[PDB]
Structures are given as structure tokens and as C-alpha cells.
Symmetry: D2
Subunit: 388 residues, 4 copies
Amino acid sequence: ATFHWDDPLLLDQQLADDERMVRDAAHAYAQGKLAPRVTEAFRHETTDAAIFREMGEIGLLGPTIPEQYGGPGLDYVSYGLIAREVERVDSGYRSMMSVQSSLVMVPIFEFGSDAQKEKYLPKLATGEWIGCFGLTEPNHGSMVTRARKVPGGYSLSGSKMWITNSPIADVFVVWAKLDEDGRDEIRGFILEKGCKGLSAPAIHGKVGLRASITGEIVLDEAFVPEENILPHVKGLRGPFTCLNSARYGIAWGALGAAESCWHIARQYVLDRKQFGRPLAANQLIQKKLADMQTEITLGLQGVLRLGRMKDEGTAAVEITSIMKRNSCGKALDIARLARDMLGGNGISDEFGVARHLVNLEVVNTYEGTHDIHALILGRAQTGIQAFF
Amino acid sequence: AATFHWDDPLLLDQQLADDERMVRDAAHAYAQGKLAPRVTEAFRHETTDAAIFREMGEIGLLGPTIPEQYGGPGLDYVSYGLIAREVERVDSGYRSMMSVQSSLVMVPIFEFGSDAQKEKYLPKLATGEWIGCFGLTEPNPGSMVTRARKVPGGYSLSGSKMWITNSPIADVFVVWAKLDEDGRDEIRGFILEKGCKGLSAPAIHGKVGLRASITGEIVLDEAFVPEENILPHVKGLRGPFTCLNSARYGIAWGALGAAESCWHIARQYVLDRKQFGRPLAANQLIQKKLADMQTEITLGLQGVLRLGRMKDEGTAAVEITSIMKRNSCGKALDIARLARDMLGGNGEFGVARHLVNLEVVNTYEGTHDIHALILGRAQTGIQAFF
Amino acid sequence: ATFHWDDPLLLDQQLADDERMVRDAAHAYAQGKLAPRVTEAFRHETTDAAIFREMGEIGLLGPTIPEQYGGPGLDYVSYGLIAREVERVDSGYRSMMSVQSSLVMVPIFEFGSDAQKEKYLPKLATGEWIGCFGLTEPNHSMVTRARKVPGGYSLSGSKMWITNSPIADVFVVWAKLDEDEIRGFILEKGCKGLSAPAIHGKVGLRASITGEIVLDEAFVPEENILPHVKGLRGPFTCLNSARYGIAWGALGAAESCWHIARQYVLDRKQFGRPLAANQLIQKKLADMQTEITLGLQGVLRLGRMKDEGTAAVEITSIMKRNSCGKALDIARLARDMLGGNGGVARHLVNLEVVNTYEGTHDIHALILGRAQTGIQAFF
Amino acid sequence: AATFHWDDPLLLDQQLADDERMVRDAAHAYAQGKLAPRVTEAFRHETTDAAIFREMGEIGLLGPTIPEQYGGPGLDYVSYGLIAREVERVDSGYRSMMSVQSSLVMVPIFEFGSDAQKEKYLPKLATGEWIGCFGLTEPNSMVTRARKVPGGYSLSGSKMWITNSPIADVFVVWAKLDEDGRDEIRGFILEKGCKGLSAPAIHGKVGLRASITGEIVLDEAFVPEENILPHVKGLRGPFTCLNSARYGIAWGALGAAESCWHIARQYVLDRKQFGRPLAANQLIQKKLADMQTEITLGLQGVLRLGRMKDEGTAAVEITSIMKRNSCGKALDIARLARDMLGGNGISDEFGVARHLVNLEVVNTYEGTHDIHALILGRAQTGIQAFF
Ligand SMILES: [Mg+2]
Ligand SMILES: [Mg+2]
Ligand SMILES: [Mg+2]
Ligand SMILES: [Mg+2]
């Protein structure tokens, strides 16, 4: 049999025909439309908002959302393959899609009323409306953002920390405390961009994820009508369902960025010489290439198996911790190995590696989680918590 | 709704066919019931009970991939893997004995032997009535000095092989030697039988690891081999390499069994032992280590399962074995070291045995990361061995 | 301007002439008298008590103890050099000396009465009496207890994993005394109620004998309590001294592993050239050389600071953690470079114990973390 | 009675002479007073204030080892090291500017120059009145070539990634010269009046953004006879300069590592998780212990090497040990620190991200490959593994 160095376990042959078609559609879009934009977008710290309508047209937004609500009605393995192809170009583009799909469409679909689903989901699916998600606050290190009941609805006050998409978003899913019969309960609210008490100031000066627009959400007596509270969830289950979905996409995405770094490093050491032979002739270099290949190959079997289990309903949430932690950690290690194999300083095409690297350094710590995921798995094995 | 299985997070159990589960359970029953009670004393005093071969043969654990026509159980590669894992879960020495019988003796006779050789040797090897060994390694493949000379009616062999598992109890010896034919010096395989004049197999005592398996030399001083005992259908490196590729697949599964044992022992130990009035398991540094053990085993097992499936389908290139052997052996040794460093006594210390075993397994073939270089050459087209 | 691969920073030039001779004396002894013993001693788990008298006659026991009490009146740098030369042969032998010098002679010298010092120290210094240190118990605050009786104290309890105990003549035992504080007691073998059964079948440190101390109403006369210490300061002073010797010793074992690996890869061939021609092997050799070289600068400096009185106890945590950790890493790298199944294996199993001897948790990391942050993370 | 100094456990301070402590304090006062306020903007916008050379020169930080006879401060290798560490504590870009001036320009003119050249160039380089650069590396043996002409030499070729070149007054360029039957590497001093010399800046760097870098393009650049270095030929010339520079980088990288450690430590004391400081976590304390350990041991290594260089007992291989160790451990520390901060570039603590990309370049300036490991391997085994 013939060896495929770039796909040793023939992942391509473990996919169904429809899945290969989705992967190929996502690849064609990412390489055709995102790859040409990324170098300038990252340099200037901007993003073309047109990307949402482009992705929506191809059916890449809300991959698991049924066709009834304008989604493409795909499964978790297809979601993963899409994330991998987008992040192969840039993690910032993957982040924008993660927010739209897992953090906005998912909670409206899972927890919203029929009216909310019919209004918001078709617009989010086409990318006509851009979404963002407001959860984390400075004091979380539970939450300060508060919905006060007023005639006709709720009045929200508080602020959420750097939210991807917020300065260009049309739709905001915000989690806030609501007094219910004397007790505070976490509830989700849908806000629209024109809300008087809502501001979404942009944040610039980022080191990583510069191709994605990021901002805050600031609420000062932001009125939300009664019909825009998510009726079918309360407590942490709401935001946690979203985060779980998003972390699955990140686990696949990180492997795409790792693959890009590996391919760049391999091509570089083939092209560059030292002492009259390619750098690839050195055992030390070959050892690094072997490690990159091994970890990506194993990582991919992991996320594929997880996707298959999620589609069957046999996947417990702890497995997401295994795979998110493994993909993000090993991807960062690979980007570092690749970076250390390059000479020069940022002018050449190979220094797309430096971009992947700073992106992965943010992604790995965007919640601050390689260590937290370890402790989730520790507790699951031992029945003893070591968080605090 | 879904339950988490900490000991099998990706539900490997559910990825197996019913008949594969049955093979695994039979191997587990045998290893736990018959090898586990022996291992502690066998390792301590460096004794091997040759009866083990007959026990394994009776239940069809020797030469798992060898067809029923020749006395084998006619299983596939995934089954071979599952068996190796269950045996090595007890001890790598026992797995090594099996590996040698199956991949280093039965495989080359099956692949490269004449009809007569297959009919004679394989059924007795399959039952364990005859015990086999594999003579490639010499004291300090292409570098070998063991030599065959053509004589009337056969060959005369002279030379020495070192660190040969099973040799002091072997009935059948597969020996690789150089034969100069047409001025061209090439490797050929020869089948020798115990009692051959000029063949001796003195034992090596005082091993650090793999003490549950008996190992020795093969010393050949003008050992006569009749013409009908040369393997007719192979010349050169393909011969020994085919055997080693088969054995490496089993070791990739086996090492993960030893790793699982170390993980499970470490986990139980840190639940039981206390420091500062809390179980050791309450320490973040300990939980991080347990997370890493779980992760590497879980992913390693997906790798070897997929490789086994590809081998059974005929879609696996030889380079894939390098990925998995390198990963399984390296990660297993890392896990055994992490487990060892979590223990605080001085001889639970099943871990110490697994650790010294894995140190030998990782070093058995080479001192140099040769699998990395196989993979680097496969990616770049450039050779970095010499 | 010549490079010395085996001593790149010329440690030999940073030592004074007396320190160089202490080192050379310990080396001559270790290589002449311990090296021929070690292979069989480790394999069969036998101890020869005469080793203590050999060491004592040379002046290697209690290096920091003054001449007035039988010591050679040396300093911490000298102690370190000795430990390093002994452990270059075997950690088990170093462990025997660590106990004698730091765990037995030190507390009697620092905390004992004049009578205790005059009686015990000269005999410990010559190795004619063998000491052991009873701190560790099965209960991970201690339960060994002294009760005041007419004429002295009655001691009851149990200590575990005590190096030298089955062959010891002198026992420094720490126990709680109700006034409730930890006190130190000197007992002798032959004291009614004291036993010291051996522990057999060890994985590492097999060249050293280890056991328990069992006390069942053992009478200790008033003149055998250490009068000048109470509380944790007693045992902690001893442990701090021992940890310094171990930091040096571990570097000796590491050096042996490095030198064995280097010679091996020069001797063995692959594809018609030494294994040493491979880049992967050279990187490993470079890493071994680097870590040992920097490790030795660290312990040397700490030794000079201890001798000047400028070293805080936390510095010992840095060096102990570093030396033991890096030594084990080097032993493992060296082990993985060898081919066969036969001294690196011994050093490796020894260093695995030495690393875990105090505990499984990275207590020294936590000591340093607390010292940087002001926040406790032990429990 | 001994107190523990967590930030200096082995009391490096007490291992220095009084004059060495004064040099260190002077460098620290300058770097903290004049470089720290510039660095954030300088790195963000990729700008370099050339006034820095004059500031450093007037307090005597340029060419530390150069004798007083030639305008240098007449200090020793330990002092050079201490200065580098104080500058790089602020930024590697600033240390790189100084490394070039001191080790790559003043050192070759001092070691290999005529008395006329030493008298002309060194006093001006020492004050920062003239800024130097060093042209060895080519865009890719050496292709830049000098041809004998009446009155001197005509140089053609190109050098790439040359720190200081777009602001330089003095250019030390290594070129092949075919002369009297042998083709040899020679060193040439070029200046601003040279019509065939240009030095366009390179912008868009990932790391070392606070230091200006350019090319040296030579198109029949005339260099008079009096401007060739007379007392060196072959690789000895540039290698002497690099060996000197590497010593300063070994000290410098420890300064950058110290900054990353101090930032991380302060962050984990200030930031909370589950109601307690991040510093309360065992996982975090382990990382802090590792940072402290490697910096402490690293500093003992570079101090000893400095003492040996000053005594004349240091072989060049020792520089490989320390360069490799300082750069490698510093980069590991910056990555540990980065991974502890998380977030994205906005806060003052993301000075760590700046040190990190700087150290990634400093390690890459060495090569694609662990060449210092192979220098050390050959020195232990007598076997070459470079080819
Ligand atoms: Mg393909
Ligand atoms: Mg507004
Ligand atoms: Mg089960
Ligand atoms: Mg100017």
C-alpha cells in the first residue's frame, strides 16, 4: 500500500461522501476567499464583515442547525471539518464562525421560543445578521450583569469582556442575573444592535487574533422586551451548552492551524540549505517533522472519534476536555517547533507561522484553560476536586 | 445523558466487533488467571515456565494471524493487537515470548518457507509443543558477520547471535546469515533444530528488565543445515524486516497495556496515600499527571486500532508502523516514569517492574531514534541515517 | 585557553588546594574500596559495616565537626566534594554517610550537652559507632511519645524507613513530650525496649541497609535528651544539612552516567561509524554537559554562602530540587542511549528513590513558590 | 540570621566588585529612566530613536572592553555582561543595537585594524557620534567581492538583516578579495560619502522591532586602501566578533527572562480565580520555581564565563554552552510566562509578548538548527556531525 505522509491513517477514507463534500467546499472557500485577505487583515487589525454573507451563502454557518431554520442540517463531524479548513487559514476567521454557530445560533435553537427561532436563526444562517455572545466579566475571577424587571420587559446593566464580533454584531446573546422570587437566576437575553442602552466598543492593539474584530458589550439600562428572554433555560446549563459546542470546533480548528505550520516547516527545510544540503538532511530536523506528523495524526483520530460519538449521543462532556486540551496544547507545541525551524524575521511567506503561533497562544489561553481542563479530567478520575 | 468512562473515554469497547471482544476477554482471562499469579516470583528469580507456551497454544494465542490450515487460530491484526495488550498488561516478558513465537518465527516460515517447512513447523509452533527463536542480532542486519557456506547437501553456518529471547528453551531456530552467491553477499534465513551439532544456546542471566523471559545466545560452530532448511522465497533485508514489522505492531499494542497498568496502579495509590492530611490525588500536580496518562493512552489506542483496521484492509504502508511503534513505546515509558515518580516507597511496585521492562523494550532494537528517521525520510525524500 | 570538556568552567581552579585534596582523597577511597564492592552489594543487598570505619579513618565522617570532637574540622564545600565522590560510585554509600554526618553528628553537635558531644561525637567520627535518625512515621504530626518518669523518660512509638537502623549503635529519635513539643533523644543499641528490624527486598539503594525503629516503653535517662532544641527546628536543621550533601551527591551520579554514555557511544558502531557521529546523540551529550556544569556552579556557590553564613534555608530547596531532578533526567537519557540489558541501571534506580525519598509531591517547588508569593499551596 | 532574596537567591550582588556594581547601577538607571519610557511605542510602531547611541556613549556604555586610550570606558567582560543584562531587561532590540556597536564594530577595528583606523573610528563609536553596523550575512560561500583598483578596492554585493544599517555612519563589511593568488575573506570599513553604498530599511519585522534593520547594497562601492583591515583574513575575522557578541547575548537573554518572570509573578498575585490569587495554585507555583531556578543557575554560568574571559582561561566552546543555555532557557521562560497570562496583548503585562517574539528572533539569529549542541558534541567526541 502507498504511504500518505500528509494523512498517514487516511482520514480521507474514514469520512462519508457528504462529509468529504463539506470539507472540500470549506477548503475551496477558505483558500479562495480568506487566504487572499489574511495577511493584510492581520497586519491592519481589521476584518471584512462581508465574510459572514459569503460563509452563509455556502452553508458554513450554524452547521448543526436544521434546514427548517435556514441551517444546512449537518452533523458534528461536518462542523469539525469546516472549523479545521477555516483555521488552516487563520484562527481569527474560525473564531468569528465559532461565535456565530456555537455561541449564538446554538442557544437560540436549544433554548429559544418558536418565535425567536423563526426570527433570528434564518438571518444568522445566511450571515445577513451577525451574532455575538456576552458571558464573561472582570469579576468572575457569580456575575455582576443584572436584568431588572420593568414594565414590558427587562432593563440590563453591566459589562462583558472582549467579545469577538461585538462591534459589527446585529444580534447579542447576553447572560445576566434576574431576581426570581427572591433568588438570582442566570438567564439569557437576546438584544439587537440599535438598543439604546447598548454599546459595543471595539478593542485594538491585540497580539493574536488580529484578523477578527473584537470588542466589549456595555449595558446601561438596556431595555429588552419580555419576548426576548430565552424561555427554556436557567442557570449555568445555558452558557455551558454553548461553550461545550464551541470547544469542540476549537479542537478541530487547532489541528488545521498545526497542519499549516507543519506543511510550511517541511517545505522550508526542503528549500533551504546549509553546508551544501537541504536542512531536511539533518537528523534533528527530521525528528521534529516526525513529532509534528505523529501528534497531528493522533489528534485527528481523537476529534473524529469524538464527533462520531457526539452524533450518536454517546459522548460525555469530559471527552471534550480531553480533546480541546490535547488539540490546543499540541498545536501550540507544533507552531513553536515550526517557528524555531525558521530563520529571517517576518517578511517571507513562511512567517505565516508567526501569525499561527500568536493566534494559538491566545486560543490556548482565551479562557485560561489548558490547566483547568486537566483538573476537570483529574476530578473525573479521582472524585476529588483540586480547583480550589 | 451520556456517562463518562474514565478508564475508556472513547469507548474502545464499542469500536470492537463481538468476536474481537471475545478474543480480548479470553486473553484477559488467561493473563490474569495464569500469568498474574506467576509474575512477581518469575521476575524476582528470573525463571520462565516453558509450560506457558503450551498453555497459550491451547487457547490459540500463538501465531494469531496464522491460518487454521497450519494450526493457527486464523485471527486478524486487531485480534493480535488485543491479545498483546492483555498479556503485556501483566508483563512485557510474557508478551516478548509470544511476540517471538508469532511474529519472529511463525511469520517468516509462513511467508517465506516451502510447503514442507510450513507443514512441519507451523502446527507444532501453533500448539507451543515446539518453542521458537529468532537469531538476527549479533554482538557489537547488513553489518552481520554470521555466515553460511554452501557444502554438498546443504550449508555450514558459523557465527554468534546475542540477546535471543527463548533461545535456551527453543526447539526451532530461525537464523539469518550471509551467503555469498555470485560474488554477492546476501542475507538468507535458515531453520535449525535443537540437537543440531555445532549449535548451542547458553542462557544470559542477570538481566535488568524482561526478567520473566529467558534469553540467551545462539553460537554456531560449523552447524550443518540440510538444503531443505533454507527459507527458499526470500533474500536480503526483506526477510528480517517483514518479521520485525509484524512484531513492532504487537509491541505497539502491548506497550499500551503496560502503560494502562501503570496508570491504574498510580491512580489507586494516590487515592490511598495521604500527605498533609489529604489524599495525594487532591494535589493539582498529581491530577495533571493523571490527565496526561489518560490522554496519551486514549489517543495511542485509537492509533493502533486504526492501524490494525488498515492492515486487515490492506491499506497500511509500513511507515505507519513506525508512527505507532515510536508513539506507543515512547509514551508508555513516559507514563511508567510519571507513575514511578508518583510512588514514594521502595519495592504498588509492580510499576517498577513495568518501568524496567519498558526501558528494555524501548531500547531492544536501537539506541537511536530510527523510527523518527524512517518518517523524516518518508516526508522529505532525504536519508539521514548515515 | 584549552577547553576541558569534562570540566568546562574549570571547577578544579575554583577550589582551594585543601579542597582539591579532600576531593582526591574521597575519590581514591571511593574508587579503590567502594567501586569493587558495589556490584555484588547491590545485587545481593548486603552491607559491610566496616565501610564506616574506613571512611572515619580517612576523616570523611562529620566533615564540618571540629577537631576537638574527632572531626576533620572542614567546611560545607568539603562536605559536598566528599558526597559527590562517594555517590559517583553509589547513592547507597552516600546515604550511609549522609545519615552519619548530617542526621546524627550535626544534631548532637548543635543541640547536645557537652557530655553528649564528648561521649558520642568522637566515636561517630571514627565510624566505630554507627548512627541513625528516627523521624519518619507511618502517620504522615508524629505519634512517637516520651513520658516523664523517675530519672528520665519512657519512649513509645515506631519509625519507618530508617537508613542504618539495623546496624546502628546510636539512635537520634524525635518524639513528642508533654510539658506538647517535639524533643530529641539519644538512645543506644542495648537499651531495653528498642528494636531495629531490617527492611529487605528494596528496589533502590540496595547497597545501604534500612529498617524500622520500634520503641516499647524504652527508658531514656535525663542526660540523654538533647537539651538545647525544641520543635521543628531540631529535625529541620538536620534535614537541611543532609539535603545539601544530596545536591552534590546527585551531581556525582549524573557525571558517572554522562561519562558512561559518552564512552559507550564512542565504542559502539552503527552503519560503519560510532553512534557518537549522530546529531541526536550529540544533542543529548550537550544537554548532559550543560546541566551538570551549571548544577555544580550552583552547589559550589551555595557551599561558599553556607561557609560565610549568608545562605538562607530556601536556597537549599533550589539546589536540592535542581540536582536531584536533573540527575534523574540525565540517568534516564543515559539509560535510553545504552544497548543491551546489564552501572547506569543501578544509578537510575537509586536516583528514582533519592528523588522520591522525602515525598511524592514537589515540596521544594512549593517552598520556593511560597517564598516568592507569600501564599501557601501545600494543602 | 541570613535573609532569603527571592529575586537574587545566590546574591550575585555580593559576587561583584564595587566598580562592577557601579557599572550595573549606571546601566540600570539609564535603561529604566530612558529606555523603559520609549519601548512600548518603539516596538508597536517599529521606530528607533538614534539619540539612544549618543545617550549610551556619554555615560560610557558603548564598547565596554575598549581601552581608555581609544575613548572606551576600559572595563572588563563581567561589566559588559552586566550592561547587556540591564539593557535587555527593557528590550532585546536595544541590547542588539549595543551588541552591534560594541562587539561587531568596535571589537574588529580594535583587534584587526591599523593604528590609524583605531584612532579615527573608535573614539567616535565610543561616544555614539558615529553609529556602526556589521555586514556578513547574505540573502543567499560568500558572494560579496572586493576588486583591486587604483587607490583601493571596488566592492559589489549585498548583505541582509543588518542591524543599524539605515542609520549607520561606519560599515564593517566582510568580502572576498582575490589578491596575490589567494581568494580570502577580508574586512573593509566603509563610510557615508560612498556613492555605491546604500542601506534601505526593512520594515514589517515580527521581533526586535525597537531596533532598525536594513540591507547593505554595494554597487562598485569604492573603499580606499587605508580602509581595509590589515591584520586578519579568513573566518577568524567575523568569528571573533560573533564570539564576543554571543557572550553579551548570553547575559542579555537572562535580563529578558528576569523581566518575564517578574511580570508573571506580579500577574499571578494580582489576578484571581475561584476567589483566590492565581499564585495560590500549585501548578502556578511550580512554574515560578522553575523560572527562578533556571535564571539563578544561568547567571552563575555567565558570571563564571566572564571571570574566565577576564583571566584568559576561557575557550570558545564555553561561549557555546552559555549562549545555548541562556537563549534556550530564556525562551522557555518567556513561553511559560506567556501561557500564564493568557488574554490578548492589551494589558501592560503583555510586555511578555514583546519579550517572547524578541527572544524567538534572538534564538533564530543563531540558525535553524542546534549548531551549538553540535559544537559541544564534537568537542566531547572528536567527531563532526554538521554534515
Ligand atoms: Mg491527500
Ligand atoms: Mg449603542
Ligand atoms: Mg467498564
Ligand atoms: Mg546619524
